[PDB]
């Protein structure tokens, strides 16, 4: 009944030293029934990464919408959109459906190509921006993620250390949520290289 | 949320806490609740956070255009009239509860506005879940003809009352001082009385702790030449 | 299950170095009607305890009779009824807390919020709360209803923790209580200007002050306030 | 009433000329000179304040106008047409950009929006 | 929750998962869903955990009193009926129970009774109860035979819970196995589903849909 | 409607759909074909609310046929499934949404690959090796999870499908009157007339 | 809320308390419920603060535009505009407004517009939650053609009792006097009116 | 309509060591968005080397603890001052809870102590009496924030040995009382940051063969 | 209903209207709401007629049995018996009773027992639906130690206004005077009190 | 439970009762015997709410067996049916009524006549040549109204019963997993093990 917990799933993003990381589980379900273990919730438009949790039809719809909008942005601006600018676009786009909203929990992650500054942001379903320095969490196991991130996180982690921290935050949070899991992906993002790792986790 | 507005000698000061919550969970521990409508007209919002931001930026946008059209610096009564007529039209469905303060050619002003479109005038105001804690302090220490320094003190003390006594409020105190014939000074994290203590342990993992199935490079670059 | 009819608002209290203070206004409201203006909601039990009650007044009068009967009963076959075997604040509280929880468990509560303030035999300060649910708690400052929201923040500025209690004199404590009652009169629509205040000190005993009034009120600034936005006159 | 001019007033002549645009350019030619120069660390725009009367306060007539905090405009030709274009340009910078991206438009895109408005007055009914 | 029990040549296999949830929140992964009523009788937990724990422990006390009075082991029929008659008295009050009372006596042989909080008492060969019961039934129905060996039967029960634990969001944690003989039940260990899944995937070649 | 199953094997997609149509008390029909051919190499089965199912399916069919004529070209199964998803995603926020769940089984002639897409009435799309809608998956997925291989032949797929239907006929309370089975491969769409 | 308007010999006086509540919490203890829609046409507001402010602002706009075209409007005209808004939008409004004004031709006039959007011209009017408690007092003590001082005393005493019994009413007593001489604002504090 | 239940917030945590056990809980008591008390003890010494906490609705929690303490007293009277073992106390509490199955104690109960072999023991109850012996259990408001952390840092879940890449698990080495107390403190410090009902103070009761000891730590008061 | 009891120098006087309504229909226009529970202890009834009659009958029985054993009861004792019934059965009763009596030792006493079953000893009391409209009038006009004639005038004027504004109140004004001299019944008709 | 049918022919009463037991989503059993022998020549089939059905049936069985022992005599089918009706009529105004419908098929040894009684959970008793409970009659009564004769043999009764079951299997949405058929005559009660 609650649209934000029909399909399940989680996304988490962290900042490190000259890097950012964004991760998600791979589950899609119809309440108790597991339907897909390949439903990735992280997308990217150039060097800007977007994770989306919530109702899966809206996740897919919003990805297609932001691809649409960032493609036109690029054609007109003659440059790729930046994390800070894209964050405002997501907020704008969500609030324009204020009284018929998309049931989602987006998370932006990326590095500004000019300043080199790491950036993350989170939103509620109608566009309110949470611009945290440390970490952003979203999904059916957001409480669990807040608990993991709050204790495991420390600032200025190197890329390869940040990977372990965010991976362990996601994994252990997902294992305490019935509607999350069935696989996981972690993106480690640097100014001009991005690595994507699929994690091994329990499949129940 | 705890937000206050206090009038003083030559201006007005507005203050707020920095906790944003999702029910009993703290989403952001250092939220910015002090918003700019125009350079010398600031407001603080309680209620639905997306509504308080959206309604400030919309009226702020229209206020800027109005300022340009009229070749005049924006007035607080204009921001107020525009806000209340917008909120009234949406019959309380836009859950924005604001305290609006500022200086303009007419003088210094302080207003509160509720989601349904009603407005109020005052020398001291409070709003949010910590408004009762804050108002207890304001009613105990407010007086006529406050100085700038006395008003900043009173305002931040009123926010502190909310921070310590209201569960919906916490973390830091933000302040913005709007004095007549001066630039408005925004004092982000004016007070920082809630720094987390050092943890007993480091939770930095050994590299290789996490099990990995696959690795791959993600192409973020555009299609290449040659 | 019922609904409160005639009600009493906030009861506020705090500890200080040698004892406790408790206060409550003299109003019995009938919804928004300020019906009864001479209601005493602080009820002394002996010379060491004062029970402050808010909520349903008919239930308050019932509790008042229970406490009166408690004193009678304690005196039965008790040669030390006015000495070693006198009623303690802790005895009185535990009895009330037992009744309140029993009544809520029969789904027929006494629709009240109660604060028992007193000084024990050994001179220790006693201050504990109980309500219609049987929920109990203690704190250096305690308040019911609106007082919880507006009085506690002010009183906690004087006694923020246990170690502040010995540093707090009776003059400072009473001052804080009286100011809080003024703030509640400004801001609680179901409050009155008239109130009662009781001090229970380990040295000077029980001092019960009736017919107190909220004074030193600020209203003058109202003359400058015009309209609701754009009005100038 | 109703605007019953739903047809174009600018049309191609046999020679391929759009007469009304050419004539608009002729009006610009009669206008007071304005110029712009770009430097390495800035841009300058300038014009003459051709006061219609010495009793007129020419400071109240702004030929150079702020469009955004980082964009300015000057013109040559019909002053009233310029004034309404400045109003539209200021508004479109907000409605089609700042309310979407939370930042002011880059010069080239604001120019593009103004250009679109001027193009439409060349084809609309 | 996923619980099953089936009769076969060598007695009864009882297999359960270990997960307990409160909404989406996984409260525990180490729940004991087999209640050791006594050394000869087993009961499964489904519905309200307290109702199953409490009344099946009470059942053990009644079974003990019976054998003291009658100097004879209680039948599975009689034991199951003590429980079903009890919950039937409470019918309408709000008990929630779905259990399989499993035993192996001389007169009856291996016997399973499905007992339920609305008063149902069914004797049968295969039962599966819980949110993941349909998944377990599929594996059971297609692989069940009376002439299964104890080893193969134990695996079948283990594999059937795994099937449910994978697909059902509210089933998982670990698998608990029991084998009920005439001389009593024998515990066959706790098996983490996480480790078991990968092991079964490799050895069996199943779950090709899942990347490992 | 009730049970619709799908399985993608090596070189084909197989869709199985129940034949029963029940209007409350009585089974009005036991030979209903719950499918529409969208293009020569794309088949869509459907289940959901009465009326809306056929209306939606025929509406999609008309649109894909229109595209085929306009461009003289058959859209890929992926392209068709995306079009269908958008229509359902559009529909879910309409005045009266299409309460229709679909499976799209297609053979991509460009990639020479079978493809199975599962889309529910919300517009939730997933590409799967095997799929179902309603309660069908609850009974059948444990069997498919065990036996499925990506290199299965069409005949092996049909045998695994029979096992699934047998389990449904055993444990499901409703009599769905068997299934019509159709195969989608490089040569197009054909119906298995004995199942 | 306790509000009233009383006609007297030289014109009319509006009176009001200053308490605005959100449940039992006094959100504003120094509210100004006496609002100006024209130079010598004011109103007393009761009901939804948002509604009565919105209505009053629209009326002020209408009478400003009326004045620009047709000169000073009558108090009856102002009441008509109020009524038109309150009646036509009765389903979506909770407003009880008393309109009071001074003409030179008509002198002091009072119109009350209760919930339904009906209009009633009266010698004096009372409204708000606190008015219930002073129906008897006001009916017994009102006289026509009172002096300014008598009318001030009548309003002060009436609202004093309304405040005494109504929890939703309180604070200061504000008054606005409308005569040929002009517009005079008055204020009376608790220590003054509580001892009456 | 009268609602006989309430929520007083709070969070509790019980961890069983090799030869010790801790039961910790914050000292904050709340209703809605107000603080009732910054120090209202929630974990109690019930005698016979048993510590107990019933978190949730404080009136029911106080009633249950009071009844159990009384049960210990009468156990001694009726059974020649026999020590009530932790397993016997657990079964006794089940019956106390299930006795109100149709009008429950709205609490999550945890007890801690040592078993009859001297090993650390923790038992966890639901509101209607279902119970289980556990190694690690958080209860109350911030339980969902704490338990995943404990799965990771106590049971070393999802942690593998470097170089093996998921083939060898991090071995489950025993934790000292000092090590456990660090994790408890960090758990509550983290919970205090992200949960509004958690704060003010932390009181830990440690149980060993020598008896029951207390430790108190301040927490943020916002 | 409009009911009141007022203590004065020589004792106490009870006052009441005579209207009993079933919705908007006046089922009885000549009701007697002043009921005797003892020789010089009477009560004014408001709320459910069935409940207040049942209660009064039980009290009359209790005080009759009290008198047989212990002699004349006090007015406080009568109020206590009323309270005991109203408080213990608060869930199933809708009764608002004013108790008034005359002792020689205590003289005139008035006790009001509102809905909850609480007791309040007062110099005078007002209750019933019509009382709301005369809180201000009664508070301004009541004095202690009035004469019999003043008290009759005070009650007559008060209930006159209550009847004027309250549709549920009307008919005649009944009064019962309780003094050392005895018990006197008074009645005042519409043509008398409407012109006040 | 679901379908229970009864038919009284020349010299016997035949009761047919479905074998399925469904608990919501799954069919837990497909061999359930929804009947109890009350006395050597009296059989009672039953359907209704879970638990209450068997509890009621066994309670009746115990009572009739008690009577049989006390008096050393078998009560007539009419007497048994009256006892059962009273128990249900008593039950319908209880705190929690037995939600159980029954058919009582008995052979009266005194009158040498078969007798079929239909009693619903309210205590509504009727003696019939053929009867049913629930929706069973909606599908079967038109066939019974046509073919039934009072002088039918047991074999003809079984054939007419087969036609009824076939119509049920065709038009009923639920799979009731066939029926167990039992015959009550002068020699007692026996089960037809192939149907
Ligand atoms: Mg999980
Ligand atoms: Mg699972
Ligand atoms: Mg008042
Ligand atoms: Mg906190």
From Swiss-Prot, chain B:
Signal peptide: none annotated. The active site is at 1 (nucleophile). InterPro entries: Ntn_hydrolases_N, Pept_T1A_subB, Proteasome_bsu_C, Proteasome_bsu_CS, Proteasome_sua/b, Proteasome_suB-type. It catalyses: Cleavage of peptide bonds with very broad specificity. Keywords: Cytoplasm, Hydrolase, Nucleus, Protease, Proteasome, Threonine protease, Zymogen. GO terms for molecular function: endopeptidase activity; threonine-type endopeptidase activity. Its main location: cytoplasm. GO terms for cellular component: cytosol; nucleus; proteasome complex; proteasome core complex, beta-subunit complex; proteasome storage granule. The keyword Cytoplasm applies. It is found in: Cytoplasm; Nucleus. GO terms for biological process: proteasomal ubiquitin-independent protein catabolic process; proteasome-mediated ubiquitin-dependent protein catabolic process. Belongs to the peptidase T1B family. The 26S proteasome consists of a 20S proteasome core and two 19S regulatory subunits. The 20S proteasome core is composed of 28 subunits that are arranged in four stacked rings, resulting in a barrel-shaped structure. The two end rings are each formed by seven alpha subunits, and the two central rings are each formed by seven beta subunits. The catalytic chamber with the active sites is on the inside of the barrel. This is Proteasome subunit beta type-2. It comes from Saccharomyces cerevisiae (strain ATCC 204508 / S288c) (Baker's yeast).
Curated annotation (Swiss-Prot), chain C:
It comes from the Eukaryota. It is found in: Cytoplasm; Nucleus. One of its GO terms (biological process) is proteasomal ubiquitin-independent protein catabolic process. Keywords: Cytoplasm, Nucleus, Proteasome. InterPro entries: Ntn_hydrolases_N, Proteasome_beta4, Proteasome_bsu_CS, Proteasome_sua/b, Proteasome_suB-type. Coiled coil: none annotated. Pfam families: Proteasome (PF00227). PROSITE patterns: PROTEASOME_BETA_1, PROTEASOME_BETA_2. GO terms for cellular component: cytosol; nucleus; proteasome complex; proteasome core complex, beta-subunit complex; proteasome storage granule. Belongs to the peptidase T1B family. PANTHER family: METALLOPROTEASE TLDD (PTHR32194), PROTEASOME SUBUNIT BETA (PTHR32194:SF6). Non-catalytic component of the proteasome which degrades poly-ubiquitinated proteins in the cytoplasm and in the nucleus. It is essential for the regulated turnover of proteins and for the removal of misfolded proteins. The proteasome is a multicatalytic proteinase complex that is characterized by its ability to cleave peptides with Arg, Phe, Tyr, Leu, and Glu adjacent to the leaving group at neutral or slightly basic pH. It has an ATP-dependent proteolytic activity. PRE3 and PRE4 are necessary for the peptidyl-glutamyl-peptide-hydrolyzing activity. Present with 16900 molecules/cell in log phase SD medium. This is Proteasome subunit beta type-7.
UniProtKB/Swiss-Prot annotation, chains F, J:
Present with 21800 molecules/cell in log phase SD medium. It comes from the Eukaryota. Non-catalytic component of the proteasome which degrades poly-ubiquitinated proteins in the cytoplasm and in the nucleus. It is essential for the regulated turnover of proteins and for the removal of misfolded proteins. The proteasome is a multicatalytic proteinase complex that is characterized by its ability to cleave peptides with Arg, Phe, Tyr, Leu, and Glu adjacent to the leaving group at neutral or slightly basic pH. It has an ATP-dependent proteolytic activity. This subunit has a chymotrypsin-like activity. SUPFAM superfamilies: N-terminal nucleophile aminohydrolases (Ntn hydrolases). The 26S proteasome consists of a 20S proteasome core and two 19S regulatory subunits. The 20S proteasome core is composed of 28 subunits that are arranged in four stacked rings, resulting in a barrel-shaped structure. The two end rings are each formed by seven alpha subunits, and the two central rings are each formed by seven beta subunits. The catalytic chamber with the active sites is on the inside of the barrel. Belongs to the peptidase T1B family. One of its GO terms (molecular function) is endopeptidase activator activity. The keyword Cytoplasm applies. The modification N-acetylmethionine is found at residue 1. It comes from Saccharomyces cerevisiae (strain ATCC 204508 / S288c) (Baker's yeast). The modification Phosphoserine is found at residue 76. This is Proteasome subunit beta type-4. Its main location: cytoplasm.
UniProtKB/Swiss-Prot annotation, chains G, I:
InterPro entries: Ntn_hydrolases_N, Pept_T1A_subB, Proteasome_bsu_CS, Proteasome_sua/b, Proteasome_suB-type. Its main location: cytoplasm. It is an enzyme of class 3 (hydrolase). Keywords: Acetylation, Cytoplasm, Hydrolase, Nucleus, Protease, Proteasome, Threonine protease, Zymogen. It comes from the Eukaryota. It catalyses: Cleavage of peptide bonds with very broad specificity. The active site is at residue 1. The keyword Zinc-finger does not apply. It is found in: Cytoplasm; Nucleus. GO terms for biological process: proteasomal ubiquitin-independent protein catabolic process; proteasome-mediated ubiquitin-dependent protein catabolic process. SUPFAM superfamilies: N-terminal nucleophile aminohydrolases (Ntn hydrolases). GO terms for molecular function: endopeptidase activity; threonine-type endopeptidase activity. Its EC number is 3.4.25.1. Belongs to the peptidase T1B family. The proteasome degrades poly-ubiquitinated proteins in the cytoplasm and in the nucleus. It is essential for the regulated turnover of proteins and for the removal of misfolded proteins. The proteasome is a multicatalytic proteinase complex that is characterized by its ability to cleave peptides with Arg, Phe, Tyr, Leu, and Glu adjacent to the leaving group at neutral or slightly basic pH. It has an ATP-dependent proteolytic activity. PRE3 and PRE4 are necessary for the peptidyl-glutamyl-peptide-hydrolyzing activity. The side chain of Thr-1 acts as a nucleophile, and the N-terminal amino group acts as a proton acceptor. This is Proteasome subunit beta type-1.
């Amino acid at each position: 009944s609650d649209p934000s917990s029909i399909n399940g799933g989680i996304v988490v993003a962290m900042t490190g030293k000259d890097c950012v990381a964004i991760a998600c589980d791979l589950r899609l379900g119809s309440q108790s029934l597991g339907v897909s273990n390949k439903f990735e919730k992280i997308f990217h438009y150039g060097h800007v990464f977007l994770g989306i949790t919530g109702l899966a039809t809206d996740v897919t719809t919003l990805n297609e919408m932001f691809r649409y909008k960032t493609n036109l942005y690029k054609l007109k601006e003659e440059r790729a959109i930046e994390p800070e600018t894209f964050t405002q676009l997501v907020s704008s786009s969500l609030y324009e459906r204020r009284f018929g909203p998309y049931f989602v929990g987006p998370v932006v992650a990326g590095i500004n190509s000019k300043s080199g500054k790491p950036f993350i942001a989170g939103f509620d379903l109608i566009g309110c921006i949470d611009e945290a320095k440390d970490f952003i969490v979203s999904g059916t196991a957001s409480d669990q993620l807040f608990g993991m991130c709050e204790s495991l996180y420390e600032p200025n982690l190197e890329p390869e250390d940040l990977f372990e921290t965010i991976s362990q935050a996601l994994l252990n949070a997902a294992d305490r949520d019935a509607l999350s899991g069935w696989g996981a992906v972690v993106y480690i993002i640097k100014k001009d290289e991005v690595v994507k790792r699929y994690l091994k986790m329990r499949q129940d | 949320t705890t937000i206050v507005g206090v009038k003083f000698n030559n201006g007005v000061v507005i203050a707020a806490d920095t906790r944003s919550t999702q029910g009993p969970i703290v989403a952001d521990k250092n939220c910015a609740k002090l918003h700019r409508i125009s350079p010398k007209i600031w407001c603080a919002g309680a209620g639905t956070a997306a509504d308080t931001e959206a309604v400030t930026q919309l009226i702020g946008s229209n206020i800027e255009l109005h300022s340009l059209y009229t070749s005049r610096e924006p007035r607080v009564v204009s921001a107020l009239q525009m806000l209340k007529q917008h909120l009234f039209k949406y019959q309380g469905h836009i859950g924005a509860y604001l305290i609006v303060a500022g200086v303009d050619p007419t003088g210094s002003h302080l207003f509160s506005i509720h989601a349904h479109g009603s407005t109020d005038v005052g020398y001291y105001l409070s709003l949010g879940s910590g408004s009762l804690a804050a108002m207890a302090v304001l009613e105990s220490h407010w007086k006529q003809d406050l100085t700038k320094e006395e008003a900043i003190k009173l305002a931040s003390d009123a926010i502190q009352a909310g921070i310590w006594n209201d569960l919906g409020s916490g973390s830091n105190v933000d302040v913005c001082v709007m004095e007549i014939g001066k630039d408005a000074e925004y004092l982000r994290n004016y007070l920082t009385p809630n720094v987390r203590e050092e943890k007993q342990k480091s939770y930095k993992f050994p590299r290789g702790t996490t099990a990995v199935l696959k690795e791959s490079i993600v192409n973020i670059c555009d299609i290449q030449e040659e | 299950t019922q609904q409160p009819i005639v009600t009493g608002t906030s009861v506020i209290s705090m500890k200080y170095d040698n004892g406790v203070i408790i206060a409550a206004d003299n109003l019995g409201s009938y919804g928004s009607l300020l019906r009864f203006n001479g209601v005493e909601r602080l009820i002394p039990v002996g010379d060491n305890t004062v029970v402050g009650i808010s909520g349903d007044i008919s239930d308050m009068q019932h509790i008042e009779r229970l406490l009166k009967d408690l004193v009678t009963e304690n005196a039965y076959d008790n040669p030390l009824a006015d000495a070693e075997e006198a009623l303690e604040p802790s005895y009185i509280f535990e009895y009330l807390a037992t009744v309140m929880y029993q009544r809520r468990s029969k789904m027929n509560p006494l629709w009240n919020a109660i604060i028992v303030a007193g000084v024990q035999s050994n001179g220790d300060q006693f201050l504990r709360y109980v309500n219609l649910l049987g929920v109990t708690y203690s704190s250096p400052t305690l308040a019911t209803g609106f007082g919880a929201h507006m009085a506690n923040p002010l009183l906690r500025k004087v006694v923020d923790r246990e170690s502040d209690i010995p540093k707090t004199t009776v003059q400072v404590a009473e001052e804080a209580i009286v100011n809080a009652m003024r703030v509640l009169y400004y801001r609680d629509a179901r409050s009155s200007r008239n109130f009662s205040l009781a001090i229970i000190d380990k040295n000077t005993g029980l001092t019960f002050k009736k017919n107190l009034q909220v004074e030193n009120m600020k209203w003058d600034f109202a003359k400058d306030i015009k309209g609701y936005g754009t009005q100038k006159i | 009433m109703t605007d019953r001019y739903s047809f174009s007033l600018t049309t191609f002549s046999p020679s391929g000329k759009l007469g009304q645009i050419d004539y608009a350019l002729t009006a610009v030619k009669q206008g007071v000179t304005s110029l712009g120069i770009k430097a390495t660390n800035g841009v300058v725009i300038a014009t003459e304040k051709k006061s219609s009367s010495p009793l007129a306060m020419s400071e109240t007539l702004s030929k150079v106008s702020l469009l955004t905090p980082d964009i300015g405009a000057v013109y040559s030709g019909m002053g009233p047409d310029y004034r309404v274009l400045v109003d539209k340009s200021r508004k479109v910078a907000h409605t089609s950009y700042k309310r979407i991206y939370g930042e002011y438009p880059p010069t080239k895109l604001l120019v593009s929006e103004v250009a679109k408005i001027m193009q439409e007055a060349t084809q609309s009914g | 929750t996923t619980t099953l029990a089936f009769r076969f040549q060598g007695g009864i296999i009882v297999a359960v998962d270990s997960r307990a949830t409160a909404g989406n929140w996984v409260a525990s992964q180490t729940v004991k869903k087999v209640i050791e009523i006594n050394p000869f009788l087993l009961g499964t937990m489904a519905g309200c955990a307290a109702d199953c724990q409490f009344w099946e422990t009470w059942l053990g006390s009644q079974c003990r009193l019976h054998e003291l009075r009658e100097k004879e082991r209680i039948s599975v029929a009689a034991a199951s009926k003590i429980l079903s008659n009890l919950v039937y008295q409470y019918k309408g009050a709000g008990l929630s129970m779905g259990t399989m009372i499993c035993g192996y006596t001389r007169k009856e042989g291996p016997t399973i009774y499905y007992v339920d909080s609305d008063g149902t008492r069914l004797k049968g060969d295969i039962f599966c109860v819980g949110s993941g019961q349909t998944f377990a039934y599929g594996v059971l129905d297609s692989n069940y035979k009376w002439d299964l060996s104890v080893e193969d039967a134990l695996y079948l029960g283990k594999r059937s819970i795994l099937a449910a634990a994978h697909r059902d969001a509210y089933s998982g944690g670990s698998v608990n196995l029991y084998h009920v003989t005439e001389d009593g039940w024998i515990y066959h260990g706790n098996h983490d589903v996480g480790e078991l899944f990968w092991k079964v995937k490799e050895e069996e070649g199943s779950f090709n849909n899942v990347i490992g | 409607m009730d049970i619709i199953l799908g399985i993608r094997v090596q070189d084909s997609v197989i869709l199985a759909s129940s034949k029963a149509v029940t209007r409350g008390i009585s089974v009005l029909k036991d030979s209903d074909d719950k499918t529409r051919q969208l293009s020569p190499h794309t088949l869509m089965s459907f289940a959901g609310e009465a009326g809306d199912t056929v209306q939606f399916a025929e509406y999609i069919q008309a649109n894909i046929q229109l595209y085929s004529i306009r461009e003289d070209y058959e859209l890929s199964p992926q392209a068709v499934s995306s079009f269908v998803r958008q229509e359902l995603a559009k529909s879910i926020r309409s005045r009266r949404p299409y309460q229709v769940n679909v499976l799209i089984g297609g053979y991509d002639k460009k990639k020479n690959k079978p493809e199975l897409y599962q889309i529910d009435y919300l517009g939730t799309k997933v590409e799967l090796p095997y799929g179902a809608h309603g309660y069908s998956g609850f009974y059948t997925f444990s069997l498919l999870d065990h036996h499925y291989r990506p290199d299965m032949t069409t005949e092996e797929g049909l045998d695994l499908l029979k096992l699934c239907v047998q389990e449904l006929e055993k444990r499901m309370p409703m009599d769905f009157k068997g299934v019509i089975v159709k195969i989608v491969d490089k040569d197009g769409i054909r119906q298995v007339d004995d199942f | 809320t306790s509000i009233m308007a009383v006609t007297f010999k030289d014109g009319v006086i509006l009176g009001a308390d200053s308490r605005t509540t959100t449940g039992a919490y006094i959100a504003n203890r120094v509210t100004d419920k006496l609002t100006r829609v024209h130079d010598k046409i004011w109103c007393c507001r009761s009901g939804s603060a948002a509604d009565t402010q919105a209505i009053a602002d629209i009326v002020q706009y209408h009478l400003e535009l009326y004045t620009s075209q047709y000169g000073t409007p009558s108090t009856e005209t102002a009441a008509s505009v109020f009524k038109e808004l309150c009646y036509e939008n009765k389903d979506n409004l909770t407003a009880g407004i008393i309109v009071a004004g001074y003409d030179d031709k008509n002198k002091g006039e009072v119109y009350t517009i209760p919930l339904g959007g009906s209009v009633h011209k009266l010698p004096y009017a009372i409204a708000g939650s606190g008015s219930t408690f002073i129906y008897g007092y006001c009916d017994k003590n009102f006289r026509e053609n009172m002096s300014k001082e008598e009318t001030v005393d009548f309003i002060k005493h009436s609202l004093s009792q309304a405040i005494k019994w109504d929890g939703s009413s309180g604070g200061v007593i504000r008054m606005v006097v409308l005569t040929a001489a002009g517009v005079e604002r008055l204020i009376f504090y608790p220590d003054e009116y509580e001892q009456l | 309509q009268f609602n006989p239940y309430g929520d007083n917030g709070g969070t509790i945590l019980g961890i069983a060591g090799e030869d010790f056990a801790v039961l910790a809980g914050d000292t904050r008591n709340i209703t809605d968005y107000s603080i009732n008390s910054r120090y209202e003890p929630k974990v109690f010494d019930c005698g016979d080397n048993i510590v107990m906490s019933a978190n949730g609705f404080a009136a029911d929690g106080d009633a249950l603890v009071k009844r159990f303490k009384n049960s210990v007293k009468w156990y001694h009277f009726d059974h020649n001052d026999k020590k009530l073992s932790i397993n016997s106390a657990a079964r006794n509490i089940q019956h106390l809870l299930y006795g109100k199955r149709f009008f429950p104690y709205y609490v999550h109960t945890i007890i801690a102590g040592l078993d009859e072999d001297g090993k650390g023991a923790v038992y966890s109850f639901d509101p209607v009496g279902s119970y289980e012996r556990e190694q690690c259990r958080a209860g109350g408001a911030a339980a969902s924030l704490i338990m995943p952390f404990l799965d990771n840092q106590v049971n070393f879940k999802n942690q593998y040995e470097p170089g093996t890449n998921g083939k060898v698990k991090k071995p489950l080495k025993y934790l000292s009382v000092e090590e456990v107390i660090k994790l408890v403190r960090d758990s509550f410090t983290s919970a205090t940051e992200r949960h509004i009902q958690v704060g003010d103070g932390l009181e830990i009761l440690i149980v060993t063969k020598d008896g029951v000891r207390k430790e108190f730590y301040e927490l943020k008061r916002d």
